[PDB]
């Protein structure tokens, strides 16, 4: 783990047309930050670009939350305390975890893509400034 930024994206787009991604900010050798980010199909750009621009497209406006929204703020703080993208226990048929408490959306996508983020540990994406 050489201090940089590791992200991994969902292989396909989900129900709202977002590829949920997990962006790991490693700094001082270890994880300091983590960002919730996602690529939209019809938009063409990432959560980073669509948030900055204001062109937030969703392919499903009347459906479930297949996105890391502001409830993912509960999930990210839980990653920072662990320093561990693979350590987690879910008890559901999807990926509900009671170990966080506050995030009632399935956290399975977050820890899935966090393992894929640090798979090379030499990956370098758009470096964020999360605190």
TrEMBL record:
Protein name as annotated: FMN-binding domain protein
Single GO molecular function: FMN binding
Interval of the full protein contained in this chain: 38 to 159 of 159
Organism: Acetivibrio thermocellus (strain ATCC 27405 / DSM 1237 / JCM 9322 / NBRC 103400 / NCIMB 10682 / NRRL B-4536 / VPI 7372) (Clostridium thermocellum)
tRNA-binding among keywords: no
Cellular component GO terms, alphabetical: membrane
Segments forming domain FMN-binding: 17-121
The UniProt record lists the keyword Translocase: no
Alphabetical UniProt keywords: Signal
């Amino acid at each position: 783990m050489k201090d940089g930024t590791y992200y991994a994206e969902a292989d396909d787009f989900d129900e709202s047309g977002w590829k949920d991604t997990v962006t790991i900010e490693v700094k001082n050798g270890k994880i300091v930050s983590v960002d919730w980010n996602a690529i939209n199909k019809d938009g063409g750009d990432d959560k980073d670009t669509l948030s900055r621009n204001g062109g937030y497209k969703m392919v499903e406006y009347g459906g479930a939350q297949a996105e890391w929204h502001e409830q993912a703020e509960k999930v990210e703080a839980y990653l920072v305390e662990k320093q561990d993208p693979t350590d987690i226990k879910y008890k559901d048929n999807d990926g509900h975890t009671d170990a966080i408490s506050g995030a009632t959306i399935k956290v399975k996508k977050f820890f899935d893509l966090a393992q894929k983020a640090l798979k090379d540990a030499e990956k370098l994406e758009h470096h964020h400034h999360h605190h």
